[PDB]
C-alpha cells in the first residue's frame, strides 16, 4: 500500500504547490 504525500509527489508538481513551506 503506497503513500499519499506531497514529498510523494513528483518536483513538477511542488513547484505547482505554494505552500506553507513550500518555499522555492
Excluded: D, H, I, V
Amino acid at each position: 500500500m503506497t503513500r499519499s504525500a506531497f514529498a510523494n509527489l513528483p518536483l513538477w508538481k511542488q513547484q505547482n504547490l505554494k505552500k506553507e513551506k513550500g518555499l522555492f
